[PDB]
Curated annotation (Swiss-Prot):
InterPro entries: Churchill_sf, Transcrpt_activator_Churchill. It comes from Homo sapiens (Human). The keyword Cell wall biogenesis/degradation does not apply. The keyword Metal-binding applies. Zn(2+) 1 binds at residues 1, 4, 29, 65. This is Protein Churchill. Coiled coil: none annotated. Disulfide bonds: none annotated. Zn(2+) 2 binds at residues 29, 32, 60, 63. Zn(2+) 3 binds at residues 58, 70, 87, 90. Transcriptional activator that mediates FGF signaling during neural development. Plays a role in the regulation of cell movement.
């Protein structure tokens, strides 16, 4: 309900994830008032030309209302990798890593 989160799309100093629920930003629901109560459902995955995308939602373990929506997208460009995340709860973040054909991933 947006009142579920302390901050809307908090920055994570570059952290981009396809899993979990950010309990440190979740202040507990406002449809029912419960905390440390959540599930994940409708989890989709997409892949275009080397880019990998993961989209999902968070649901209150008590009232099963949709707490928030999550998106994580990952792209490979020429010699580098790009990571981006956007979630009302988990946060908004972006990172880029330079790599080699030896696949070292820093
Ligand atoms: Zn809520
Ligand atoms: Zn709730
Ligand atoms: Zn999230």
């Amino acid at each position: 309900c947006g009142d579920c989160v302390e901050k809307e799309y908090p920055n994570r100093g570059n952290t981009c994830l396809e899993n979990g629920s950010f309990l440190l930003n979740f202040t507990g629901c406002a449809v029912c008032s419960k905390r440390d109560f959540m599930l994940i459902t409708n989890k989709s995955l997409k892949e275009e030309d080397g880019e990998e995308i993961v989209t999902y939602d968070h649901l209150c373990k008590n009232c099963h209302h949709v707490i928030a929506r999550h998106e994580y997208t990952f792209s490979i460009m020429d010699e580098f990798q790009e990571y981006t995340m956007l979630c009302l709860l988990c946060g908004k973040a972006e990172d880029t890593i330079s790599i080699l054909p030896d696949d070292p991933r820093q």
